[PDB]
Design an enzyme around this catalytic site. Structure first.
Site, PDB file in Angstrom:
ATOM      1  N   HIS A  74     -16.672 -17.073  10.603  1.00  0.00           N
ATOM      2  CA  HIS A  74     -18.449 -17.161  10.177  1.00  0.00           C
ATOM      3  C   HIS A  74     -18.596 -16.375   9.168  1.00  0.00           C
ATOM      4  O   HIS A  74     -18.992 -16.523   7.700  1.00  0.00           O
ATOM      5  CB  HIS A  74     -19.111 -16.777  10.446  1.00  0.00           C
ATOM      6  N   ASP A 116     -15.296 -21.419  13.339  1.00  0.00           N
ATOM      7  CA  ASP A 116     -16.174 -20.997  13.097  1.00  0.00           C
ATOM      8  C   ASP A 116     -17.183 -21.599  14.135  1.00  0.00           C
ATOM      9  O   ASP A 116     -17.985 -22.824  13.740  1.00  0.00           O
ATOM     10  CB  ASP A 116     -16.819 -20.898  11.701  1.00  0.00           C
ATOM     11  N   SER A 157     -25.538 -20.160   6.724  1.00  0.00           N
ATOM     12  CA  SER A 157     -25.691 -20.195   7.814  1.00  0.00           C
ATOM     13  C   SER A 157     -27.023 -20.076   8.037  1.00  0.00           C
ATOM     14  O   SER A 157     -27.042 -21.725   8.207  1.00  0.00           O
ATOM     15  CB  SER A 157     -25.447 -18.625   7.722  1.00  0.00           C
ATOM     16  N   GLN A 158     -27.536 -20.029   8.869  1.00  0.00           N
ATOM     17  CA  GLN A 158     -29.398 -20.066   8.756  1.00  0.00           C
ATOM     18  C   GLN A 158     -29.917 -20.886   7.246  1.00  0.00           C
ATOM     19  O   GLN A 158     -30.830 -21.936   7.817  1.00  0.00           O
ATOM     20  CB  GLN A 158     -30.243 -18.874   8.994  1.00  0.00           C
TER      21      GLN A 158
END
Length: 197
Positions: free
Chosen positions: A172, A159, A104-105
């Site tokens: 996600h 996602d 993710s991030q």
């Protein structure tokens, strides 16, 4: 469990052969979050507990959700943290093979840090895994400056972060099986390609 600092804590007279640097997703706990422990356990099984050092990105990386909207998909302070860990690995254990990952991030953070890294260090990263890569569309599935053969992206259908949005949908949150199987598989293969068996 969810915090591993093996590189920071480790003795440089006893370096591991393999060092794994991993960045967690937004709002996740420790420095490994939800996926990192699964990857770590499988790397320990392959290389032995003393053969691999597991290091999450902690420090200045607060994994704040809103930082996904910043230019590089994370903060400048987080990039500096992750760059510093790669530099520490290079200095403490010059002969170690590096591997990296993020979710993710944390995937955006891994990509930005690897882009900015001195080339001599970047070239020591035998493989990188990215889950729920928030810059997947923008970067056309690549990490800038880093070879495609050393990169593995896990982007689920549906996602939305993989198709240019910042909306968090159920797919996600569905990377657990990848973290248990194909992701460590790939990292192990890429280390063995360069180190032998």
């Amino acid at each position: 469990r969810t915090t591993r600092d093996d590189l920071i804590n480790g003795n440089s007279a006893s370096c591991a052969d393999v060092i794994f640097i991993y960045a967690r997703g937004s709002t996740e706990t420790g420095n490994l979050g939800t996926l990192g422990p699964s990857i770590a356990s499988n790397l320990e099984s392959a290389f032995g507990k003393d053969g691999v050092w597991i290091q999450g990105v902690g420090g200045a990386y607060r994994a704040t959700l809103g930082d996904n909207a910043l230019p590089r998909g994370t903060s400048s302070a987080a990039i500096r943290e992750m760059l510093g860990l790669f530099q520490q690995a290079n200095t403490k254990c010059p002969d170690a093979t590096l591997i990296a990952g993020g979710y993710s991030q944390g995937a955006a953070l891994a990509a930005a840090s690897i882009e900015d890294l001195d080339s001599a260090i970047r070239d020591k990263i035998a493989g990188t895994v990215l889950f729920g890569y928030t810059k997947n569309l923008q970067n056309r599935g690549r990490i800038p400056n880093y070879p495609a053969d050393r990169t593995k992206v896990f982007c689920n259908t549906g996602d939305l972060v993989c198709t240019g949005s910042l909306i968090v949908a159920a797919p996600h949150l569905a990377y657990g099986p990848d973290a248990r199987g194909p992701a460590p598989e790939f990292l192990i293969e890429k280390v063995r390609a360069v180190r032998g068996s």
